Amino acid sequence: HRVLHLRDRLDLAAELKLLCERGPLVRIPLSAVHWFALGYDVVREVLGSEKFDKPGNLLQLDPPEHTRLRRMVAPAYSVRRMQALEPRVQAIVDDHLDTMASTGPPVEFLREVAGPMAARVACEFLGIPLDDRGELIRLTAHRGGKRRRVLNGHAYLAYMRELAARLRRDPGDGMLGMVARDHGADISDEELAGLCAVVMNSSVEQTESCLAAGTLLLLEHPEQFALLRERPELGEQAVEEIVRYLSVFEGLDPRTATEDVEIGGQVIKKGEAVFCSLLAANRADDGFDITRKESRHVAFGHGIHHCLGAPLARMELRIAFTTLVSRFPSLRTAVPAEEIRFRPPSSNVFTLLELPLTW
Amino acid sequence: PLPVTARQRRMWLLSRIGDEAEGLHVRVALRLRGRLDRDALAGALADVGGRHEILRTRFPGSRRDVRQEILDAETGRPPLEICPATEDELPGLLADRAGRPFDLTGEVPWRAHLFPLTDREQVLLVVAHRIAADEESVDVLVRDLAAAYGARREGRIPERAPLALQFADYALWERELLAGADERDSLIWDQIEFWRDRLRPVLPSRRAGSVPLRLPADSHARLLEAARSAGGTMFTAVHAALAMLLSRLDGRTSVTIGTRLPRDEEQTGLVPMVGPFSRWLALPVDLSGDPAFTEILGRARDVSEDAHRHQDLPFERLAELVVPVPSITRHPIFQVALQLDEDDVRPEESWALPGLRTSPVPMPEEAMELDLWLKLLDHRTDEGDADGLVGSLVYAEDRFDRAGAEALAQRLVALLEQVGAAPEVRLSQVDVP
Ligand code: HEM
DSSP states (O other): OGGGGOBSSSSBOHHHHHHHHSOSEEEEEOOOEEEEEOSHHHHHHHHHOTTEEOOOOGGGOOTTHHHHHHHHHGGGGOHHHHHHHHHHHHHHHHHHHHHHHHHOSOEEHIIIIIHHHHHHHHHHHHTOOTTSHHHHHHHHSOOSOHHHHHHHHHHHHHHHHHHHHHHHHSOOSHHHHHHHHHOSSSSOHHHHHHHHHHIIIIIHHHHHHHHHHHHHHHHTSHHHHHHHHHOGGGHHHHHHHHHHHHOSSOBOOOBEESSOBOSSSSOBOTTOOEEEBHHHHHHOOOOOOTTOSSOOOOTTOOGGGSOTTHHHHHHHHHHHHHHHHHHOTTOEESSOGGGOOBOOSOSSOOOBSOOEEEO | OOOOOHHHHHHHHHTSSOTTSOOOEEEEEEEEESOOOHHHHHHHHHHHHHHOGGGGEEOOBOSSOBOOEEOOSSTTOOOEEEOOOOGGGHHHHHHHHHHOOOOTTSSOSEEEEEEEOSSSEEEEEEEEETTTOOHHHHHHHHHHHHHHHHHHTTTOOOOOOOOSSOHHHHHHHHHHTTGGGSSTTOHHHHHHHHHHHHOOOSSOOOOEEEEEEEEOHHHHHHHHHHHHHTTOOHHHHHHHHHHHHHHHHHTOSEEEEEEEEOSOSSOGGGTTOOSOOOEEEEEEEEOOSOOBHHHHHHHHHHHHHHHHTTOSSOHHHHHHHHOSSOOSSSOSSOSEEEEEEEOOOOGGGGOOOTTSEEEEEOOOOOOOSOSEEEEEEEEEOTTSOEEEEEEEEEEETTTOOHHHHHHHHHHHHHHHHHHHHOTTOBSTTSOOO
């Protein structure tokens, strides 16, 4: 059952490739009977069907509560708003790549470039007081010490209650400003803090993971690294190809079937939880090619729970990847590829442990 | 007329002693690799001072009375020395600048010393007098300096939610719920009565060294085992062991160690602010008769519960009430202190000035009044089982040398291993040569 997260490096491990040969939807009895959705069309079905089920945490919410919170937050990612945010993100990307260059090579790209960049973009998008960003990261990070995590939770909730009061009086820009503007007392400080914390934490983890592993992925295809510098209009396609190839969100939470459904010839009884492997559906048809048009992938999910931050993620990844490849043509890894350590299969996102880069 | 606190009162007095005695300061040295915007660093330093009134607070007065004079951000910004150096001479410069005394009557209680090494590498030292900053304030200092620098390096004023409480509010709160000192059966009166019944060079240097102290998991497990057996913690197990060692070394039937507690974690408003929030707790244990380690573990456990039920009276005020002839060369009530910490995230790993590769520069042990400060890490497996006890015996140089401290550390490790493997051992039949 751990096979869904076994990888070579960025590539599918052999055991997972043998499993995907066994059709795009397999049943597996353990203890209970689980299901693996491994195909693009099969994963779309099990996510787009109304026959499955799973504060401020949209991903663990279900209708009608999921609808109530998704409605208030969704217009924050509008096409016009993301376009208005581009020059700010571009300046943020340029600054971090200035720090990267001035500090000089080598650089630990993940914690010194990618992480700070993702969190700075996420905080400008949220409308967080721009210099309380470090404090909100620190108070909501998952660094252990359960008493400390509870105390940090108490301190962050107190800050958010003061910020929500300030915002509900006279709001401002950012997702938090709009949610406080269009909705007052319709959303609580708890839900406001939950939405904000999901953005600057797990969403930042995925963004920084795409930035780091995406950089490595471009580095290991140098002709496409140069091609993106040569034809920067390929950025949108390159990002769609990168997120498809990386699949940092490898597997999804189980979609327990509320009815007895037959996606294919195999019957799924009510209660047989089906696990979506976006990594398999994206990588089992395949090579990296940023010139591909109309990328066919499920890297941002599907159905009512499809990624709410995909507009910002795509936007930020395009600006970062295209700016990076043109600013560092001689960019390379500072260590041999074998020394590149990847997170052990832990079911919660896929990422590098670190990315030593030089130029 | 803004009052000071009991701790500030004691810190102010001990600050008038001179260069020979190392200043009682907290300090942090940061290695900053990259292009540093010196004028932004100066602005960010002033911004931290503007954010925390106590960092721009001055302490004029005399032996009978000290006052908190809060300056504005500009007049009262911290001084910033720029001292070009080579790595060669950084150890001596950091020690000297960290020890330079403060004139708290006409100076803000912190300062910064920048040491340019190259155009892309500097070392920054921040010193703050303990009248204004405790151990936890150093983390707050660096984090707020990082937040202010990131904004200043972009030609912008720091945009942060201000402090809900200032330390002036804490000083008045202490002057309030404490004013009932002379009133039968009052809250603090009950506590003042509790501690009464419960309880060398003429000029100190306060220089501290440290020797390592390691206990293998085997003996660590047996102490945790005996601690659980008596309803105590690992702190209680080491407290009892240390109380036996000091009892035999000094030949005394009544040993009193202390422990430093941080700011009140319940009062959540104190979380993001700089201040002398260190609370000290005496833990007097009576070893009368000839108690066994299990029995001493009980006495240690019982005094820790009663003491934590009586921690609203500040240690410095209690000192004034039970010390007849106070000494600047021997710490009041206790001279040995014990810290037992569970493993946790290190704040130094998460210090980052935007635009600069930030990493901490080690400094010598902090100046202290204690003779011995045993700081131990209580390592555990994911299940909570003992996984070694690792730490340092911080010793006063005016009182021990490295050999005398190593002999002490080894003597305690032996005692720890003995009482763990035989918790019924009496105080008299314990092995301390
Ligand atoms: C700024 C960046 C991002 C933000 C703000 C963001 C936000 C969110 C939110 C709020 C949800 C839950 C929506 C709901 O349940 O209705 C979600 C789900 C999801 N996100 Fe993102 N996200 C970001 C980046 C990414 C990236 C880079 C990936 C790469 C794989 C990703 C993959 C997913 C997936 C697959 C889901 C659906 C999970 C499931 O259905 O079980 N997201 N995202």
